[PDB]
Amino acid sequence: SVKSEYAEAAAVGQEAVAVFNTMKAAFQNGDKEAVAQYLARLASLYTRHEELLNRILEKARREGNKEAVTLMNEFTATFQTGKSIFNAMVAAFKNGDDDSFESYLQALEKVTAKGETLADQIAKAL
Numbered sequence: 273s274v275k276s277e278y279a280e281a282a283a284v285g286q287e288a289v290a291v292f293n294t295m296k297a298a299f300q301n302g303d304k305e306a307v308a309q310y311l312a313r314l315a316s317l318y319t320r321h322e323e324l325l326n327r328i329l330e331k332a333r334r335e336g337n338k339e340a341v342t343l344m345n346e347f348t349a350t351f352q353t354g355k356s357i358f359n360a361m362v363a364a365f366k367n368g369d370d371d372s373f374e375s376y377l378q379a380l381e382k383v384t385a386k387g388e389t390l391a392d393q394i395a396k397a398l
């Protein structure tokens with residue numbers, strides 16, 4: 273169902289959380305070779321998650337589940353805000369700009385933290 277597809281999407285999102293915290297530790301420790309690899313892994317995870325979320329939203333639309341569509345439209349908008357912040361972070365790493373990297377890191381944490389009450393609301397709505 274769309275609901276089991278959301279659980280799969282939720283798991284991929286939690287994998288990115290796990291990899292992110294590992295990456296944050298490696299950044300603080302100055303292990304740039306690890307950070308590079310973790311950023312590549314995160315890019316692949318976010319790409320996957322985005323694809324699953326789009327399929328869920330399109331299916332909710334085809335099902336006429338108006339509440340789930342409303343919540344998913346907002347949640348995807350937020351996801352893109354996290355995605356832009358992540359991409360800026362990747363560029364800061366390429367450029368060697370640790371000050372910007374720290375800034376983007378914290379902002380991506382707070383954006384993700386904010387978008388969690390909605391994530392739970394979607395699970396219940398699908």
Ligand SMILES: NS(=O)(=O)c1ccc(F)cc1
Binds near residue numbers: 319351356384
């Ligand atoms: N902030 S988030 O929604 O977890 C997110 C972070 C990075 C992405 F590339 C896409 C989404």
